[PDB]
Amino acid sequence: SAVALPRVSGGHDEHGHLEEFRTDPIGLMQRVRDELGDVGTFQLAGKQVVLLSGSHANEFFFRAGDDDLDQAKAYPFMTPIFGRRKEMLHNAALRGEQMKGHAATIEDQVRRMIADWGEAGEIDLLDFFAELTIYTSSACLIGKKFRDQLDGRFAKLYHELERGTDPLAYVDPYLPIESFRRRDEARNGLVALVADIMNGRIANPRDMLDVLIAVKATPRFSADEITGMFISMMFAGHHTSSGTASWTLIELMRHRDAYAAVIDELDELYGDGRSVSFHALRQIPQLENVLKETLRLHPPLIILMRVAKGEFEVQGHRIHEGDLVAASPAISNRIPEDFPDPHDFVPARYEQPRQEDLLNRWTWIPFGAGRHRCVGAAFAIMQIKAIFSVLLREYEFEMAQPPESYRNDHSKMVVQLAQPAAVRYRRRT
Ligand code: HEM
Ligand SMILES: C[C@]12CC[C@@H]3c4ccc(O)cc4CC[C@H]3[C@@H]1C[C@@H](O)[C@@H]2O
Ligand SMILES: C[C@]12CC[C@@H]3c4ccc(O)cc4CC[C@H]3[C@@H]1C[C@@H](O)[C@@H]2O
């Protein structure tokens, strides 16, 4: 009875386009736009995904309220991981008055991570930034006391947790596969770590954990419940910040002229004698523009999803209740009409005379837009500023593998930098 929306080619595997989505999601999404335009679809197992692109369609997507396009059940792969949410789990730590302190905390975490680097050596970006961001996230979003009781084990387990987000979750988040088994085992390991910390606290007597432990119903929360809360407080900001930091360093190393400009700027700026806690909250133009361009080319979330709660018409095409509706920062961020030479790294794109990020309000979307725009955006930008203010003034970096060999692993809904990502460092002098 109802007219079928345009469908992208391919998708003849068991679960439609799901197999291709797991192997090359960006290529799939780009083909949707190339073949069909601003509104096109692909099949994700038993669900149809209406992929929107372009300013007009994206505006509809981002301005829609939860009453029209619901985000609530659009990300099933998160249910097994976690086991009003922002107000309860994110807002407190993100208040403006807390930022100065967070910048100092982040600076401290970076110095601790590079304390044993010495004069020269080599690191792997995924291993370094994944661990560093576990410490900045836990210290800032949960507590310094809590972070001090964490070590490499927590980071290793958290990573396996993130790897348990295969697209098969859209079939069922509890299917019997290896990645989901490891996901549950990883979560169980985190619960054990938290339980140990709790017993240590109780053993010999205040942060967030101290408060949660004292809540009663007989203790109201188990280690599993507390662990779920902590996992949720750090998740949205961990893989995003980890990856963005890695790609920021990669692009600087790939474009030494920009790297040189950032170095000169940092040296001049800190010449006033103020701390990172002062400068990370204020303008650092060249670095900020490198970050904006890095986010445009390497958005950590390549697809955003919603579930339609009613019927809507976008450019003559009708979206029906129950349809999965999506927008893609990966595709939108590179629309050639909006971003001249979209595949090139051009930080000048954001300088005062151009401001391509502000002019393309509905297509420059690494942080999303509208009602669900990233609430941690300011924190994330401040964190990159604080991290590189320390790293780039203390050390010099060079690629230890071909520039084109650095890449992301897109096999899971949670994008992660692929290994190896070898980089050499040497103290500046
Ligand atoms: C530069 C790194 C980051 C990027 C690129 C980024 C990007 C995004 C995007 C695109 C969304 C929208 C998802 C959707 O529309 O369904 C989002 C949501 C969110 N982000 Fe981030 N984010 C980053 C860092 C962070 C950090 C560090 C935190 C924690 C302080 C955080 C917390 C959140 C939360 C709580 C939401 C949900 C917002 C809502 O649904 O109302 N993000 N982020
Ligand atoms: C209010 C709360 C207990 C306190 C928790 C709580 C307590 C202190 C803190 O710093 C953070 C949180 C986050 C979650 C809070 C729970 C939400 C509800 O499920 C429950 O009633
Ligand atoms: C659901 C989420 C927004 C979408 C994120 C999201 C969106 C797309 C994607 O491919 C991966 C992720 C990973 C993290 C997700 C966030 C966890 C919550 O803190 C927040 O509400």
Q: Is the CB of 78 under 6 A from ligand 3?
A: yes
Binding site annotation covers 86?
yes
> Cα(35)–Cα(197) distance, rounded to whole angstroms?
54
Pick the residue whose CA is nearest to atom 5 on ligand 3.
Answer: 236
How many Cβ atoms from other residues are within 10 Å of residue 379's Cβ?
A: 24
Å from CA of 107 to ligand 3 middle: 26
Q: Give the number of whichever ligand sits closest to the CA of residue 300.
A: 1
Q: Is the CB of 75 under 6 A from ligand 3?
A: yes
Long-range contacts of 117-124 (CB under 8 A, 24+ apart): 117/395, 117/425, 118/427, 119/426, 119/427, 120/424, 120/425, 120/426, 120/427, 121/424, 121/425, 122/400, 122/422, 122/423, 122/424, 122/425, 123/422, 123/423, 123/425, 124/419, 124/420, 124/421, 124/422, 124/423
- Its domain, for residue 203, covers 1-429
Q: Identity (one letter) of the amino acid at 363?
A: T
Method: X-ray
User: Across the strands, what pairs with 422?
Assistant: 124
Final resolution, Å: 1.5
Pocket (CB within 6 angstroms of ligand 1): 71, 86, 90, 94, 236-237, 240-241, 244, 295, 299-301, 304, 366-368, 372, 374-376, 379-380
> Cα(263)–Cα(268) distance, rounded to whole angstroms?
9
Mode of pairing for the β-strands spanning 324-327 and 47-52 = parallel
Residue whose entry in the numeric block shows the structure tokens 């990966």: 330
When divided into structural domains, the chain yields a total of 1
> Cα(356)–Cα(347) distance, rounded to whole angstroms?
10
Pick the residue whose CA is nearest to atom 4 on ligand 2.
Answer: 212
Residue of 64, 84, 62, 67 whose CA lies nearest to 304: 62
124 contacts 399 by C-beta, under 8 angstroms: no
Q: Give the number of whichever ligand sits closest to the CA of residue 95.
A: 1
HSE-up of residue 246 (Cα within 13 Å, Cβ side): 32
Report the run of H or E that residue 372 belongs to, with start and end: none
Q: Is the CB of 82 under 6 A from ligand 3?
A: no
Å from CA of 96 to ligand 2 middle: 21
Here the CATH number for the domain that contains residue 286 is 1.10.630.10
User: Across the strands, what pairs with 39?
Assistant: 52
Residues in the chain: 429
314 contacts 57 by C-beta, under 8 angstroms: yes
Q: Is the CB of 171 under 6 A from ligand 2?
A: no
Binding site annotation covers 75?
yes
For residue 110, give every residue at least 6 positions away whose Cβ sits within 8 Å of its Cβ, in sequence order, or none: 132, 136, 386, 387, 390, 391
35 contacts 25 by C-beta, under 8 angstroms: no
Output DSSP code: residue 216.
B
Binding site annotation covers 71?
yes
